[PDB]
Amino acid sequence: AEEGQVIACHTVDTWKEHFEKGKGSQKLIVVDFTASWCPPCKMIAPIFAELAKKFPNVTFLKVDVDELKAVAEEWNVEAMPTFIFLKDGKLVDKTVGADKDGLPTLVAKHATA
């Protein structure tokens, strides 16, 4: 039994998790940038978990934007809500839209490569 793990995130403690997994460890790492006000990302949080059980190569994490906008904005987040792609060779990709089939397609391309 081998799977990705969606972990919720709040402070400078995600700076430890995001960065040190990505640039440190041989893996893809994937992170949603969402306000806690967002019913479209409320459906997506289960979507991101079912996809996680599908995809072992790839850590999963999710930031409250109201908490950590300085950094969200740096990665590239002018808009709700933005999935980032950070691998063992810096920022690979960026895509912003809650969509059920979208995310599984996106990771499939990325995690194959």
User: CA separation (Å) from 56 to 25, 27, 33, 89?
Assistant: 14, 10, 21, 19
Q: How was this structure determined?
A: NMR
Cβ atoms of 105 and 56 closer than 8 Å: no
Q: Containing domain of residue 78, as a range? A: 1-113
Cα torsion 88, 2, 55, 4: sign: negative
Structure tokens at 7: 């972990």
Cβ atoms of 72 and 84 closer than 8 Å: no
Cβ atoms of 85 and 39 closer than 8 Å: no
Asked about 9 being catalytic, the answer comes back as no
| Counted domains in the chain | 1
Identify which of 24, 14, 7 has the alpha carbon closest to the alpha carbon of residue 69: 14
Q: Which of 6, 29, 41, 77 is catalytic?
A: 41
One-letter amino acid for residue 87 of the chain: K
How many Å apart are CA 24 and CA 89, to the nearest integer? 9
